[PDB]
């Protein structure tokens, strides 16, 4: 009775200590202590050995550490499956995580927490392709996700240039109640601006200008659409830049220009000969601590700083040069 | 206290003949469609959802439709989950017909 459980906690306190030092057979002998005296190791004790190997980054050692769980017949703990999926996602196991996901699909356990940590862990390593596949498969059915995950993958996919994966997640996010705000649109506009075709980012912008309260355009949003129009490969594009400035000017008590807005306007107004319009804007840039280094950027994009210096000379404006 | 309790509640009789002409004229379906559309915001989305559900119905159990008019099937299914008996697929019978075809006026 009390003595039996009083003796049980004696090994129990040191049983997890065999996982404190990350022992492989030391924890086994502790289980062997009670297997000899007839003390069925409660699944929490059974799980402690699984933690011992998973803290050593033992891929198949942990699998063997769990392979005996079904052989004995004890149903593993919720923490048991949670611990393994964290390791497999951390190392990059693509199909191994789904193997556990089937187990809770048979043991009357929800996979939401396990699939959430599995998805998040896969992004914590550079397994970007794996992260999209796991999230999309689980969220295709009924699986609500925390808003933190939605922000992470939309930004992360757009960071590496995965608009196809990012757009699908955004469409999937809006299916489950959550409404896309200006932050999500800003992430999408990062890659749509660098796509050559201007009217793929404008369609996104018109979805925000005439949108609801939360999805209203931000100062970063106008920068992306301005950038997408000034580096088109063909056709006149200076008039559409005039509209965007006019809309930004009219909506001014909520939107204020920043360094990049003046930088892009200097570049756009100098490529086509609207030099006057540039000199004006240049001034604004002048009072920014970034200087013309960002306006120059690298030698790419036609070297806009070279344009401003050259075009000022060849037109007549020399004092401002 | 208000003396109109039953004067406004007396059952109108002779309604049995004004219960049938609704049923062969398609009146029940017409009066059910609007009640299903009484809560929808955009009717085009409702129509597209009905069409997609009917397409799924045709795909899953192909070898039944051609008579049942799966659009009627999905409409009856949606109307049958809140009372409103609405026999399956709004199918019409000929209870008194020792013949193949009605003249239909």
């Amino acid at each position: 009775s009390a003595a039996e459980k009083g003796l049980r906690l004696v090994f129990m306190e040191e049983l997890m200590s065999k996982a404190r030092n990350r022992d492989a057979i030391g924890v086994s002998d502790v289980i062997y202590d009670m297997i000899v005296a007839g003390l069925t190791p409660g699944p929490r004790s059974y799980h402690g050995l699984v933690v011992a190997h998973v803290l050593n980054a033992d891929e198949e050692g942990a699998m063997k550490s769990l392979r005996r769980e079904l052989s004995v017949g004890l149903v593993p703990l919720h923490e048991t499956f949670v611990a393994l999926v964290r390791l497999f996602g951390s190392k990059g196991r693509a199909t191994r995580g789904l193997e556990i996901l089937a187990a809770m699909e048979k043991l009357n356990y929800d996979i939401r927490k396990a699939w959430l940590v599995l998805v998040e862990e896969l992004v914590r390593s550079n397994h970007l392709e794996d992260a999209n596949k796991v999230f999309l498969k689980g969220a295709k059915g009924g699986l609500r996700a925390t808003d933190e995950i939605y922000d992470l993958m939309i930004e992360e996919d757009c960071k590496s240039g995965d608009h196809s994966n990012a757009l699908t997640i955004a469409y999937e996010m809006e299916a489950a109640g959550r409404m896309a705000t200006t932050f999500h649109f800003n992430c999408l506009l990062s890659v749509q601006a660098n796509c050559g075709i201007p009217e793929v980012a404008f369609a996104t912008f018109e979805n925000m200008e005439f949108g609801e309260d939360y999805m209203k355009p931000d100062t970063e949003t106008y920068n992306w659409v301005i950038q997408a129009y000034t580096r088109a490969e063909s056709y006149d594009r200076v008039q559409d830049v005039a509209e965007l400035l006019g809309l930004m000017v009219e909506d001014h008590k909520r939107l204020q220009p920043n360094m990049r807005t003046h930088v892009l306007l200097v570049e756009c107004f100098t490529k086509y000969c609207v030099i006057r319009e540039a000199i004006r804007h240049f001034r604004a840039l002048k009072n920014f601590e970034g200087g013309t280094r960002l306006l120059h950027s690298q030698g790419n994009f036609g070297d806009p700083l070279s344009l401003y210096l050259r075009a000022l000379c060849r037109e007549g404006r020399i004092e401002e040069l | 206290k208000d003396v109109f309790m039953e004067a406004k509640l007396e059952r109108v009789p002779f309604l049995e003949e004004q219960m049938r002409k609704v049923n062969e004229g398609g009146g029940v379906m017409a009066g059910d469609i609007d009640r299903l559309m009484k809560s929808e915001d955009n009717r085009f989305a409702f129509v597209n959802e009905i069409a997609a559900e009917a397409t799924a119905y045709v795909n899953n159990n192909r070898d039944e439709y051609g008579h049942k008019k799966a659009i009627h099937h999905v409409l009856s299914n949606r109307m049958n989950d809140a009372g409103f008996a609405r026999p399956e697929a709004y199918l019409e019978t000929e209870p008194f017909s020792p013949g193949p075809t009605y003249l239909k006026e």
Partner: peptide
């Protein structure tokens, strides 16, 4: 009805 189109999750 050709405005948006259906998705169904």
């Amino acid at each position: 009805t050709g405005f948006k189109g259906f998705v169904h999750h």
